[PDB]
Structures are given as structure tokens and as C-alpha cells.
Amino acid sequence: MKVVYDDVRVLKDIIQALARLVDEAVLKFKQDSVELVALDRAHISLISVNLPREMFKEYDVNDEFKFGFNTQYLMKILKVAKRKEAIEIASESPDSVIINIIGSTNREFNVRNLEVSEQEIPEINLQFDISATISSDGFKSAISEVSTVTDNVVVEGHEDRILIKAEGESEVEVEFSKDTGGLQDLEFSKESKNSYSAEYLDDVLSLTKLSDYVKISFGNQKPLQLFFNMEGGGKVTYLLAPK
Amino acid sequence: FKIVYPNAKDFFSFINSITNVTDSIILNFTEDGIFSRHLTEDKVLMAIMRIPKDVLSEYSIDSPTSVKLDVSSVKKILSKASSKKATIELTETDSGLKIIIRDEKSGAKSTIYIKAEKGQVEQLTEPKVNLAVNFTTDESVLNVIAADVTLVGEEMRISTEEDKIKIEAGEEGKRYVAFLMKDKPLKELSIDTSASSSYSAEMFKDAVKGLRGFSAPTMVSFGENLPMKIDVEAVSGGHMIFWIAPRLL
Amino acid sequence: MKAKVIDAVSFSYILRTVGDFLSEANFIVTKEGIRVSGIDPSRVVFLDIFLPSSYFEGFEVSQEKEIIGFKLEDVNDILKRVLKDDTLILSSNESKLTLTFDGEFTRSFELPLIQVESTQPPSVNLEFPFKAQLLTITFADIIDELSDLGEVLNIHSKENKLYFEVIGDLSTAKVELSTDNGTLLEASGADVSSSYGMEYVANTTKMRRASDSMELYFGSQIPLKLRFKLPQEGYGDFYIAPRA
């Protein structure tokens, strides 16, 4: 099998977060999309990656290949391309994976593929009491702001406004509204006021560079779901359990 | 009361300067506008900010008042607010203060809350002193000087020569000499009487460090064993003014 | 002496690359230019920088041979004070090395000389069975990219191609540099293989901003010479010893 991804930075953004969630993850190279579903070391979060063949320059994948890797290591070898260089991920034998970062210089990494414990992922919620689409820049600022005063990011949602706030000693409150043009698309079935681990969100912040907009969806006693709908068809999902 | 200031980043810059080593800031609202004042532990560097009423988009007051507020946390959250063309608002509250930043691009209306101490208005004590030397330069120039004065020594001696300003630090082995004149790099110089004064380099560093955020020209002014006045007009209007006490012996 | 660098920033980087190996050195200021030579504490790296007369715009000597002792921290501390545009007019007596920045405005830094051990410069040449001329940036790029993968830079040549390898426990990092790659301007030599302490080669990257072209000299169980072609017949040499 051989794939060539033209934009390594997308993959870099993904793995950067991934490495902060878990020690080892698996990149399922299926025939029509690349998958990576990974529970964190503590099972309080899930990262779901889906990169359809539509995004790759080359996509020679006939049978499902299970590319298992040290999340920390892959992230170190991805950081060799600071510019818009292309990553190439190929393998013949199922025990060795060859990674090329093609550019002015061609970096070739030959990694002894890792047979990694594929983890039974619990049943993830489809329906969220507020499914709200706000800017990824806005979301980033909102987390980064609130995180500097608490490790409890209270996320609040209504029929027009989305509140990402801190409720410690110092009270912050970031507001994405219908009229302000910050909250673009809004799907509403019930008001919800839940709080999520700020340090876990901090892990995933690098994901907010995958799409202009993030479909943040959550609910009372329901997990927070960050949906990064990229162009080409790339779906990155972060599922975070409450504190 | 109600305060709306056109550019949050500029207003944050104001807060940053006066709360340098401290986190307690006393904001005063007068008939003239907003002003806040902060001296150091050793009373050598005084940080003042004036924001005249006409510069503000909105300015309301029930009665001239002062608010003592712990900005330690507000500092952090105000920075990660990417204040491009964002507008900051400050309102009176039951609890104390209320700070709302309205972001233009993102639509984010981030609102802050802090315990304020609603005390009596402070007096704006502008030191009555004729500083013979009033030069106006870029803040970057000041920062370059500050950063490389603090590299060589503990004290900075600004003196005057023939239409030149001589900043010199370093006491024995490690000396540093700078020459600032009109058009290299001074935007305007004014030497009335030949004057020379010594200042705390650390305190100059700190004063000039606060000038970051205001791209507008900076007036520096001093005289023979007299304080140094470093004032910047804010990008969107307003005043960031530092006073550095001199060293006599 | 009295010497003026027009590119204060590039010079700023030569002396910062030296500071990575040497704590203290001597500007050996002669008629034909300023030579800085020294060996690192681990005795693995020999560096030899030569900045000729022509490298400095306006180069004057006060005596036949001036030896200017200086702590590389202290001199780089003041060199960190360079601004994008200014020029370094570094002059000296026998008391103080006075470095003057001049661009936006005039800034002189007085730095007292020190008695520094006289390391004898490489008046000996070594013969390397492989040489590769390679753009300073393209080297600086991989080495930076490789320096985070392992302590041991395993460099070998095969048929005028130059292979950089970072052979680790988990995996291996291989980089093919060729003349037909567009990465090597020229390369000829025997098929040799030797490894070098990455840390040391890593440090040598800073030269990126001081030199434009480069030469790479190595061989089986002999030092890795890194020749950083500085402007006006200049050179920044960095001999780094191999691994037993």
C-alpha cells in the first residue's frame, strides 16, 4: 500500500493533539478512507479522524492496513516539515512502515510498525442538546481565555447564544450569538450547562486549525463533541466526557 | 458608570503597564475621563494612564469614583482575546466591575467579572517640574536602549551634548554609550538647558516595557537631577505616561 | 584593532555558533584578517573561523598581531543586541574590546579583554576521502530536522551520493543527498561511512544565516569537516571527531 498526502500540516495538527491524548494510536488505512479512533490513556476522551481518499495525491490501498505508531514519535517526525511539504505513507510488509516527507530534501523514515492494543471504544452519543457551529479561532480564544483561570470550562448553550465560560473565583464568559455573527449555524433541542476538563481541551486545541468552523455539540450530563469539518471531506471529531 | 474604548488591545496595554509587578490597580473615573496611577515599592517608577472623555466612544458617570480591582486573572484572559478591531467596555456592578470585549471578526462577546473596591477618587498629581530636555522618539528605540542598558549595568545616565542625547550605562569595565540626535533616531528633540540625570536601568526597562502596544511617538523628557517623563499617546487615543525618579548621589 | 562588519546579523551568528562549543576564545587579528580558532571541552570539535580583511568593510590593524581574549557568553550577549539593519564597528585597545552598533543609532559596548589559553590553530590539513558541496540552507534544514531523532548522526557515502542516517532503537531516518537530487551542487569521493555526535553537528546550523554555500568533508573513522563558505573568501570550519 502507498498514500501520499499533499498537506502534511493537517496530519501534523491531528497527531499533535493525538500524542497529548494517548501514547500509541493506530492509523487504519482503509480502501476509501484513512481512520484513527483512539481513546485516551484514561478513557475520558476520544479522537476520531477520517481522511477520505479524496484528499490524497496518491491512494494505493487495496486491503485495510493497520499502521500502529508511537504517537509521540510520529509527531517528532512530522515536525520535519514546517512548510507545505508532502507526506508519503507506504508499506509492503505489514511489520514495517515507510514514511517520506517529500520536499527540497527527501526525508525517509523506515519505522518498525507497531502491533498496538486496539481498544474497545464505548458507544458514542449521536444527539447533542445544542449543536452549534462557531469559528475555530473563536473557540480557541474562548478555551485559551477560560483555561487560564480554571480547569473547569463550563459550556452553556441557548436558542441564540453559546457561552464558553469560567465559574471559579474570577468569572469569564465568552459569547457567540446569532446577531453578533459569531455563531453561524445553530441546532437546538434543549438548554444545556455542562463543564469539561480544560486541560483535556488544551490537548486538542491544535485541532482548531483543521477547519474555519467547529461544530461544537454537547448537552447536560452529555459529552462535549468538537466536530471539525474540513474540505475534501476530512472529519475530525473530539469527544470529551464531563468532569 | 459605563466606559467604551475603541481598541481593547490598546486598553489592555494600559492595564499591563500600570499592573507590572502588582496585580492591584485603582481605576479612577473623573469628569475629565479615566485615569489610573501606580507607584513602585521603592517609589522611583510611577505609572500613570489618562484617557480623556472625548477619546472614548461612551463615557457615563454617576459620580467621580475609584475602583480597586484584582486584575491578576483578568490580565491572562484579556490577552488570549485576539483584539484586532475589538472594543472593550467597562460597567458599574453590584459585585464591582464588568469588562466586555466585543470581537469584530469572531463575533465573540467575552465578558469579565472582578471584585472591585468602590472608593473615593484619587488625585492626579502631575509632578510640577520644568524638564529642560523634551525629546520625542519611537517606543522601539526606547526598548532597544532599555534592553541593552540592562545588559551592561544597573544604572542609566542620560545626558545632553551639542544637540545630542547621550545615554550611557556601565560603571567600570562594561560600559555602554548611546547617542540619540534629531533625525537619528529622534523624531523631535528640544534641549532648553544643558541637563544630565541618572536613572534606574531596571526601572527604565520596566517603563519602556510598558510602552509596547502603543506604536505612536513617545515623548521622553528630563532635566538636571529631575524625573524622567515617558508619555505615549495611545493608538486609538489616550495617554500612557511614566515618571522615573532620578538618582542624585 | 578597528573592524567594521556591514552585516552585523550574519557576523552575530558566526560568533554564536562558536559560543556553542567554546566558552572563551581569541580574536587573532592580523593584517590578512581575524582568525578565531579553538577546541570544545569534550575535545571532539575543532572550530576554525577565518574572517578576512575583505570581509570587513574598513579593516585596520593596530599592531602586527593582536590577540583579543573574550568570553563568548559576554560577547554574544552584546551581539544578541544587534538590530536587523545596523553595522558592527568592533574596535579594541589592549584593555577593552569595544563593539559599536550603528544603524538606527549609535550603540557602543565596552568589553574588557581576558587572558585566554592560546589554542594552536589547525596549521595541519587532513585529507578526507569524500567531499560534498551543498547549499548552506539545505544542510541546515536536514540537520535541524534530524537533530531531534538521535544523538548519533550516521553519515555515509555511496557512488557520489551522501546519506544522512539517524539509526535509533525504534527506527531509522535516511536522507538521500545527490548531485542529481538537486541537493548537492557537487559530490565526489570513496564509499565511506562514519558516525558523528549529532549534538555538535546540530550546533553548526546557526551558520545558515552567516554563510550561503557549504562544503562537507568526511571519511571512515576520520573527522567530519564542515566548511561554511562565508563572504569574501571567508570560512567557518568545524572539524568534528568521529565515533570509535
Swiss-Prot record, chain A:
Keyword Oxidoreductase recorded: no
GO process terms (BP): leading strand elongation; regulation of DNA replication
Positions of transmembrane segments: none
Tagged with keyword DNA-binding: yes
Pfam entry (one): PCNA_C
Keyword line: DNA replication, DNA-binding
Superkingdom to which the source organism belongs: Archaea
SUPFAM superfamilies in UniProt: DNA clamp
GO-annotated molecular function: DNA binding; DNA polymerase processivity factor activity
Role this protein plays: One of the sliding clamp subunits that acts as a moving platform for DNA processing. Responsible for tethering the catalytic subunit of DNA polymerase to DNA during high-speed replication. DNA polymerase I, DNA ligase and the flap endonuclease may be constitutively associated with the PCNA heterotrimer forming a scanning complex able to couple DNA synthesis and Okazaki fragment maturation. Heterotrimer stimulates the Holliday junction resolvase Hjc.
Assembly and binders: Does not individually interact with either of the other PCNA subunits, but is recruited to a PCNA1-PCNA2 heterodimer; does not form homotrimers. Heterotrimer which circularizes head-to-tail (head is at N-terminus, tail is at C-terminus) to form a toroid; DNA passes through its center. Replication factor C (RFC) is required to load the toroid on the DNA. This subunit interacts with DNA ligase, RfcL, XPF, and weakly with DNA polymerase I.
NCBIfam families assigned: pcna, PRK01115.1-3
Annotated family: Belongs to the PCNA family.
Protein known as: DNA polymerase sliding clamp 3
Organism in which the protein naturally occurs: Saccharolobus solfataricus (strain ATCC 35092 / DSM 1617 / JCM 11322 / P2) (Sulfolobus solfataricus)
Gene name of the record: pcn3
Curated annotation (Swiss-Prot), chain B:
CDD domains per record: PCNA
GO MF annotation, one: DNA polymerase processivity factor activity
Keyword DNA-binding: yes
Top-level taxon in the UniProt lineage: Archaea
Gene Ontology BP terms: leading strand elongation; regulation of DNA replication
Family: Belongs to the PCNA family.
Quaternary context: Forms heterodimers with PCNA2, which then recruit PCNA3; does not form homotrimers. The heterodimers interact with RfcS homotetramers. Heterotrimer which circularizes head-to-tail (head is at N-terminus, tail is at C-terminus) to form a toroid; DNA passes through its center. Replication factor C (RFC) is required to load the toroid on the DNA. Heterotrimer interacts, probably via this subunit, with flap endonuclease 1 (fen), Hjc, Dpo4, and XPF.
Purpose: One of the sliding clamp subunits that acts as a moving platform for DNA processing. Responsible for tethering the catalytic subunit of DNA polymerase to DNA during high-speed replication. Heterotrimer stimulates the Holliday junction resolvase Hjc. DNA polymerase I, DNA ligase and the flap endonuclease may be constitutively associated with the PCNA heterotrimer forming a scanning complex able to couple DNA synthesis and Okazaki fragment maturation.
Name listed for the protein in its UniProt record: DNA polymerase sliding clamp 1
UniProt organism field: Saccharolobus solfataricus (strain ATCC 35092 / DSM 1617 / JCM 11322 / P2) (Sulfolobus solfataricus)
Origin organism lineage: Archaea, Thermoproteota, Thermoprotei, Sulfolobales, Sulfolobaceae
From Swiss-Prot, chain C:
Source organism, top-level taxon: Archaea
DNA-binding as UniProt keyword: yes
Coiled-coil ranges from the UniProt annotation: none
SUPFAM superfamilies: DNA clamp
Keywords on record: DNA replication, DNA-binding
Keyword Heme (UniProt): no
CDD domains linked to this entry: PCNA
One example GO MF annotation: DNA polymerase processivity factor activity
GO biological process, one term: regulation of DNA replication
A Pfam family of this chain: PCNA_N
InterPro entries, sorted: DNA_clamp_sf (IPR046938), Pr_cel_nuc_antig (IPR000730), Pr_cel_nuc_antig_C (IPR022649), Pr_cel_nuc_antig_CS (IPR022659), Pr_cel_nuc_antig_N (IPR022648)
Biological function: One of the sliding clamp subunits that acts as a moving platform for DNA processing. Responsible for tethering the catalytic subunit of DNA polymerase to DNA during high-speed replication. Heterotrimer stimulates the Holliday junction resolvase Hjc. DNA polymerase I, DNA ligase and the flap endonuclease may be constitutively associated with the PCNA heterotrimer forming a scanning complex able to couple DNA synthesis and Okazaki fragment maturation.
Family: Belongs to the PCNA family.
Subunit structure, interactors included: Forms homodimers with PCNA1, which then recruit PCNA3; does not form homotrimers. The heterodimers interact with RfcS homotetramers. Heterotrimer which circularizes head-to-tail (head is at N-terminus, tail is at C-terminus) to form a toroid; DNA passes through its center. Replication factor C (RFC) is required to load the toroid on the DNA. This subunit interacts with DNA polymerase I (dpo1). The heterotrimer also interacts with flap endonuclease 1, DNA ligase and XPF via the other subunits.
Xref: PANTHER family: PROLIFERATING CELL NUCLEAR ANTIGEN
Protein name: DNA polymerase sliding clamp 2
